[PDB]
């Protein structure tokens, strides 16, 4: 059960409160489809504040009896230690085991186990152990649940190795495929794509009062992309070039008012004065999510590949940062923000999920071929901090009995009913 005001995620895409949710309601299941609300667990107790351990942190406050959904890596190593005179073939593993708490109960949780045998007995077994562990599960981790207060029962190693997980938003709206079906009756099946990329393109190095946006001259692929896309909607991308010495070539997009600036406002990529990331986009049709994203990177982001692919973007307007930090997660990317010299930074990563988003970019050093096969948008983990808190009211949302019992908080975090 969760504290008053715990923003939630409805199966339609909307964000109601845990308190305001009524019975017969649908909440967002960690798989796209909905979950039916039936009860409305009320009461009081100690409340625990879960907070991502590391300022765009994933946090949520719950009831001390709340089953946090978590994961813990499997693990097995066969070393060789000597117990004062006798050398054993120790086998350490992470496995399901019990430990009693001070309440009374026997809690079912994960523990680090050790099983040592003297050498001479031949590691023939020390091995068979390691091999049984190794082919017992089809995943490389344990999906399990422990109540908020029982986290302290975890022994060091296992605890730091345990994390909660937020889920991508596999759910797709279309407020975007629509906003367009109100001006044309002859606009390409590429409608959404092209408009998302330009829209993205507008958030990076854009300008607010005209569909004009200071683009780079040095990028002779971005140029084509920009142009070829400018016409895709219905606009020639006149500009400067071969007249106007500098690298940041201002570009103007006309209707050869203009449906571009009509989009920047209708859908609100310019909420009152300063630019802005609309939150409806988070739960909108994926490709538009990735495509819009592509634009923004192509605009003022940069891609580095040192310890894996990862793209950084910059913004000043938090009204955008916060916007991106969620449009990002909505897809499955892993994200973090760092504040520099007024200036914000959004680091994104995720392998294929990020590729799907970068194979749509066009800027010289930002493209990247699309995935090599099919790829799923797995839930992403996040280690955290749990702080014991006074007492207060709380409100659960008990789901059915033939369902998973998990639903998504507003911040994509996967909590248990």
């Amino acid at each position: 059960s969760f504290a008053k005001g715990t923003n939630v995620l409805m199966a339609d895409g909307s964000i109601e409160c845990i308190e305001n949710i009524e019975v017969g309601n649908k909440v967002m299941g960690k798989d796209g489809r909905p979950r039916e609300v039936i009860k409305l667990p009320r009461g009081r107790e100690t409340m625990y504040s879960v907070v991502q351990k590391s300022p765009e942190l994933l946090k949520f406050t719950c009831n001390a009896t709340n089953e946090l959904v978590v994961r813990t890596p499997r693990s097995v190593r066969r070393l060789s230690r000597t117990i004062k005179g006798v050398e054993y073939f120790e086998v350490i593993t992470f496995e399901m085991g019990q430990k009693k708490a001070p309440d009374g109960r026997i809690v079912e949780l994960v523990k680090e186990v050790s099983k040592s045998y003297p050498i001479s007995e031949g590691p023939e077994r020390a091995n068979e152990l390691v091999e049984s562990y190794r082919k017992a599960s089809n995943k490389a981790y344990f999906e399990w649940t422990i109540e908020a207060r029982d986290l302290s029962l975890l022994g060091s190693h296992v605890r730091k190795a345990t994390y909660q997980t937020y889920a991508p938003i596999l759910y797709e709206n279309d407020h975007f495929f629509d906003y367009m079906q109100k001006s044309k009756f002859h606009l390409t099946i590429e409608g959404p794509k092209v408009l998302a990329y330009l829209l993205g393109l507008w958030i990076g190095d854009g300008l607010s009062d005209r569909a004009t946006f200071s683009v780079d001259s040095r990028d002779t692929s971005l140029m084509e992309r920009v142009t070829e896309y400018a016409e895709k909607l219905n606009l020639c991308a006149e500009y400067k070039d071969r007249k106007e010495p500098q690298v940041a070539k201002t570009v103007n997009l006309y209707s050869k008012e203009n449906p571009l600036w009509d989009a920047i406002v209708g859908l609100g990529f310019l909420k009152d004065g300063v630019k802005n990331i609309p939150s409806f986009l988070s739960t909108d049709n994926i490709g538009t999510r990735e495509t819009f994203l592509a634009g923004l990177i192509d605009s003022d982001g940069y891609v580095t590949d040192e310890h894996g692919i990862k793209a950084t973007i910059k913004t000043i307007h938090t009204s955008v940062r916060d916007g991106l930090v969620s449009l990002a997660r909505s897809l499955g990317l892993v994200v973090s923000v760092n504040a520099e010299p007024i200036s914000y930074a959004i680091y994104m990563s995720g392998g294929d999920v990020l590729l799907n988003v970068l194979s749509k970019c066009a800027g010289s050093k930002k493209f990247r071929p699309a995935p090599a096969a099919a790829f799923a948008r797995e839930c992403r983990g996040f280690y955290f901090e749990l702080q014991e808190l006074k007492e207060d009211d709380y409100y659960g949302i008990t789901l059915s009995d033939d369902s998973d019992h998990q639903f998504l908080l507003a911040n994509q975090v996967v909590v248990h009913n």
Partner: peptide
């Protein structure tokens, strides 16, 4: 008695 679900 519960916990956002009850057994």
């Amino acid at each position: 008695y519960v916990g956002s679900g009850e057994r």
